[PDB]
Assembly symmetry: D2
Homo-oligomer: 387 residues x 4
């Protein structure tokens, strides 16, 4: 079992399976992939669609004629396979002109070029049917304190995103924006480093309803944070527009391992949350097949992404449907957590002697929470060791 | 030189110099301090004021009569010294009843008790002249994934803070609330773990103008984040109500070292930012004199907090006033960062061929940013090695 | 299934299930446990034995008469249950006299007291049948650079361990020493912070054959290290005398979660290594039942430690016995890794043109390693999703 | 002042100032540097010498004739400038053939090629006058647990280093080997991840006296470790053959910032230790000028490396020469730390009632260590704020 179907909404970036294995210390170990072949190979694996940076699809500096031919070859592959394009984004980090950022580069003319390069690809994204446009400000940041006034940089970041919102509104486009946070790498520190910082920034834009987040498993874990906890706050705010699934082994460089690798229990609690909250967006894999692999290992790693999600989905469903677990959840008072603290109102709480004057603090302190039994039941379900 | 004066607005928590040295592996190494003696000793050192948890001032379970005597003894010490009380907060973490949290405990009756305990101390804070009321949700969190539905917990957290805002409004109190984030410890993960998460949460309250943040140097660094960067976003949003100054040596347990210790360059860039942005609030030290020290080392460590701030203030002022630095800032185009990207508007940017069609991407890519020369000038100023 | 038996050699410290829930921010949530009841309760759970600090068994400052009665009550419980005592250790960290360390305290008279306190408990350990004596230097370290000359401290550390080795040799005791490394907490930095540093230090003692390591899962992970990798180097050196099993969620305070929690895949690879290398020592759990739990949750958490080990043992055995895995291991050339690089000798390697002059570097570069397929087979086995 | 002279023994790798700015997300921002020009430019800056990988000097795949011309052009630049070559090393990480390692690659023929490539460059190093040969096993490691049997890998690592030692002995070469540890990146985990693991491994080689360590500031800090503490253990063992100086801002990707940047207080305590222990080897800078910089910023960053060392040297000397500091060191009993615990021997310690039976544990517990006053004196000296 555990066979993906386009109904599962699994998507892959062209840059993921297409990664050649260039890391900061070694040359590429794999030849470049034609975007057309990647689309065909992913379709055979059961994927729902692909995503792209502008420069993944149209090589940098291409003429409007060559650009025309690239889009046509790509769209023919989409038609031949039934693959969708739910998301697109801009490469504002590879070319040396972006070495100090795009939207927040110190040089004003670089910032204007970064906006024009973005707007050009929004047009293409809408043509191809994308519903979400992702922004990863990988070069927005600094290695030293004096190089960037962060208040001025946030002014420039806000100005860029308002202008992009004004453009999609004036064009009548049906597309939303999602910010993909990352705490560091390639810059020493990157602006808007976590999901929380991105959510706070969004509330200061002119049209906040146009903007959400695209959190990535590995990036929040590069700051040692609880990724399921962060996704829950994003859902609670109504801002989970998209999500990047992969693996990461703690606080170190951005590994981009296949989903399921890294923190396995965190992946279980993530799928539990996404499935019970009814997240209906794409399940997007932003990962890198290790450079030890040939092309056969590339497709095996991409297949593993989808397989691990489906296994975890099965185990999280069985966990929540188990009547013994439902009983344990009541023993830990998860049901009381969901009830209002004071629906009777402030004045009733103040006049309630059972809440303070006559509250038996020692009797309440004595109640065990029963969390460890519940967590071992979750472990048994994850490992398939219930019976 | 480097002598503090109450005009410098340096404050200390009673729990800081009063810490007895109890850590998870060892007994206390110092006897308890009378709050009256701490106020007198801090006044002699040049401090501006003190802060307190309710249970620092009035021992838990005290009668209304003993409580009366404690407040009176305290206020007499404030009058004898001229010390102020700019901030107060609630202890919702020491007593075993709070072992699963206060505002977000699974048990509903514990949540109601936590609200009543808080409201009682808001009354006392206003009486004593506090302008800011701090909330540190140290027990709001979890060690395992099934123990806490984070969406429900955020519902309960929002409900608590709205009720507190409704109370201070109905009483006509002139006091604001500040959330002090912490990523972990004592809980495995703590809700609202960074300044960003706290800022985002605040925008969902009913009266957001009543709530800001109280970031602590060490806590953002426990997630490997750039503390000056986070303070800048808090200032940019208008939410820096208060700040906790200390030291921390990277990602590990919460050290609470004296300010200046830990990341020294981060402390320099922090003081630069606070002084140039015109932060006018208290400079509050939330620190622990190491348990290796006797009472003489306690007062030496508290004196060092204030000394290091004043030295860093002098060096950051000299850095910004140096005409060679002002020249280097222009060489790195910090002046262009502060200018609007597109004050001419979206339509003018789209019709501007110098921004894309005729932009010389290679000429712009060739410009060095000159950041390293600027950063060595900052190092020379920090070390007093200019000449 | 998954029922422990004393044949599985599972052991627990008295301080583990006996932990009262005192953390740096809150009072104890559980009453103290009689060591006799802990022995009886662990025997019922299927445990093989217990371990103890001197001060866990005999309260500090006890007379030789009360000490006599404590040992007698304890030994009667061991006889009534069949429980063993394979390991003992000294508490050189709780009492305030040890606030700057024991073996490496700056004060010479404290160092001499620390040696005498240790020697007294070695006598008791041998009487009770312990084969390993563990040393955790939790207070050996510093919060600041000038407080400790590390070369002098290592001189004092070496002097202490040589003296202990001279004592057990002169007494004819059959006991070995094991060092338990920890990188930090409670001290800002702790000496001998990892398994590697401890192994290197041991080679400088007078009788190195008497000393090995007692690594703990959580402690190596507090430095972001690969715990299975560290255990493999300890086995390779012949120094794995003992091991502490628990869980930890990355780089933060020492969590001491039940084994299986934390990094689940790391726990799988650990059990694989221990079982295939034929580690025959105790499987010791150095963990803390969370302070949210009552006594029922304490025993459930201890039962979970043993259960998770037995599940992981089953899955690692099935992984290694799978002929498809054995085939994949050959596809990744694990068999070639085990063969000598140059058994033909140096001169034969130099005269071998197939090793350099005629080596086809591009043909070898093209071979995929097939690691991702192998790792997904390990994931399928871990999750019980093979079929 | 603060002007370097070749007497200060400052060295730079050709790959440092020669770094083109290729990181995992962006193209190079600087053109390649001729090794001859780098030697001339570093000589003008006051450097003592340079170091090189084989492939830095002789491009990969070069004929024996072109190789001859490269060495000749290089040696002429050394003669024209007076620059020395104290250290050389092998590139066993860039070419795709090394994607699973060199000495510990699973494929046996790759391991033999890696040994031959190394031996060829040892010949060149000795010709050029190098005294130390550095080994950085950047590709020795794994991303997943099943890919590498670490015991077998350590067997292959030991076999490689013994063979290299047999070669330099048979040739009568006067050169030593130094291992440069790194915990991760580019591999998920790297073998021998810290200075401690490298020191322990060395004691298992056939000729341990031939091997030491080359620790790097940033690498130990990528595991959150205290770099001065690790250097002290390396000195204590007699194994500090060489050292790499740079900066790093905590646990994240390998930043390789200029020395002085990153953890400034750690850099102060490092220079204090190196200068007081009489380290006489090269002061080598393994750093990367940020890719934001042009060639002018490259030379400014390299000049800053040497400047910051000389400033820190001055401040550490003034700290140790201050009679008030010498007094504070006695107040903290640093003098007692250096005295033997029990030069009177074991039997005298056992018969000494002042060490246990009559030891006043409470009087000793009451003595403050006075560490905070001492550490603020060190801060005052570092900042030049004594007077
Ligand atoms: Co990533
Ligand atoms: Co703190
Ligand atoms: Co532990
Ligand atoms: Co490095």
């Amino acid at each position: 079992n555990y066979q993906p179907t386009p109904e599962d909404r699994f998507t892959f970036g062209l840059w993921t399976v297409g990664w050649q294995g260039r890391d900061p210390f070694g040359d590429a170990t794999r030849r470049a992939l034609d975007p057309v072949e990647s689309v065909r190979r992913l379709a055979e694996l059961g994927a729902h669609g692909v995503t792209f940076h502008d420069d993944d699809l149209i090589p940098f500096g291409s003429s409007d004629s060559e650009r025309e031919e690239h889009v046509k070859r790509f769209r023919q592959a989409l038609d031949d396979t039934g693959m969708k394009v739910p998301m697109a984004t801009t490469n504002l980090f590879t070319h040396p002109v972006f070495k100090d950022g795009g939207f927040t580069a110190n040089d004003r003319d670089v910032r204007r070029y970064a906006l024009r390069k973005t707007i050009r690809n929004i047009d293409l994204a809408v043509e191809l049917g994308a519903e979400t446009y992702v922004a990863w400000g990988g070069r927005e940041g600094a290695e030293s304190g004096g190089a960037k006034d962060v208040r001025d940089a946030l002014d420039r970041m806000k100005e860029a995103f308002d202008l992009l919102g004004e453009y999609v509104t004036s064009q009548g486009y049906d597309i939303r924006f999602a910010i993909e946070p990352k705490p560091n790498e390639p810059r020493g520190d990157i602006l808007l480093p976590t999901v929380g910082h991105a959510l706070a920034f969004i509330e200061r834009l002119e049209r906040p309803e146009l903007y959400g987040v695209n959190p990535e498993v590995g990036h929040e874990q590069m700051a040692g944070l609880n990724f399921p906890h962060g996704i829950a706050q994003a859902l609670w705010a109504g801002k989970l527009f998209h999500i990047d699934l992969n693996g990461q082994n703690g606080i170190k460089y951005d590994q981009d391992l296949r989903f399921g690798a890294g923190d396995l229990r965190a992946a279980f609690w993530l799928v539990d949350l996404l499935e019970s909250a009814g997240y209906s967006g794409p399940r997007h894999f932003d990962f890198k097949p290790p450079r030890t692999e040939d092309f056969d290992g590339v497709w095996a790693s991409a297949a593993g992404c989808m397989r691990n999600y489906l296994i975890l989905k099965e185990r999280a469903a069985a966990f929540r449907a188990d009547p013994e677990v439902q009983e344990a959840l009541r023993a830990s008072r998860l049901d009381e957590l969901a009830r209002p603290t004071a629906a009777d109102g402030l004045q009733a709480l103040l006049d309630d002697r059972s809440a303070f004057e006559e509250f038996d603090v020692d009797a309440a302190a004595a109640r065990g929470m029963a969390f460890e039994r519940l967590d071992q039941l979750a472990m048994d379900h994850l490992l398939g060791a219930r019976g």
